[PDB]
């Protein structure tokens, strides 16, 4: 019942609250489900500069209750802290949502055929060639031509 600690508008209590969460978030994944409305207070707060990290904990609760595309929306505005983590499983699940959203947008862009372009976030297209640098550095040529067929 630490949810009541979020009522205070003073920032230094929030970093100690999330310091508790992200460590035990594995066991408390069920507890974060009721923190939705009170996380948005921090995410929409202008004086709260951790909204990049607050978008991650907002993606964990929605992933717990069955929401996916909404977590991908928060992944956009999550800044560089979201795309800097390549570790374990969480990297391959987000790129499966992001690159599929990227490759279905590029096919849509080729149907314009020119002009009246849809908005393309620099973060979703930015990790394309960024993670593609991991290919040429790994020297494996077989999938180096594969990304070009993906994005078309």
């Amino acid at each position: 019942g630490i949810i009541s600690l979020l009522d205070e508008d003073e920032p230094q209590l929030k970093e100690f609250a999330l310091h508790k969460l992200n460590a035990v978030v594995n066991d408390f994944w069920a507890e974060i489900s009721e923190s939705v409305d009170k996380i948005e207070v921090l995410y929409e707060d202008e004086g709260f500069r951790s909204r990049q990290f607050a978008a991650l904990v907002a993606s964990k609760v929605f992933y717990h209750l069955g929401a996916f595309e909404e977590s991908l929306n928060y992944a956009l505005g999550a800044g560089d802290l979201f795309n800097v983590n390549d570790n374990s499983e969480y990297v391959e699940t987000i790129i499966a949502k992001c690159i599929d959203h990227y490759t279905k947008q590029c096919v849509e862009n080729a149907d314009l055929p020119e002009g009246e372009k849809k908005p393309i976030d620099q973060r979703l297209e930015g990790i394309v060639n960024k993670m593609f640098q991991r290919c040429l550095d790994d020297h494996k040529y077989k999938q180096a031509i594969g990304i070009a067929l993906e994005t078309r």
Partner: peptide, 12 residues
Amino acid sequence: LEEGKAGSGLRQ
């Protein structure tokens, strides 16, 4: 590969 041959199997 890391994109990758571990992820592509999950894709496969």
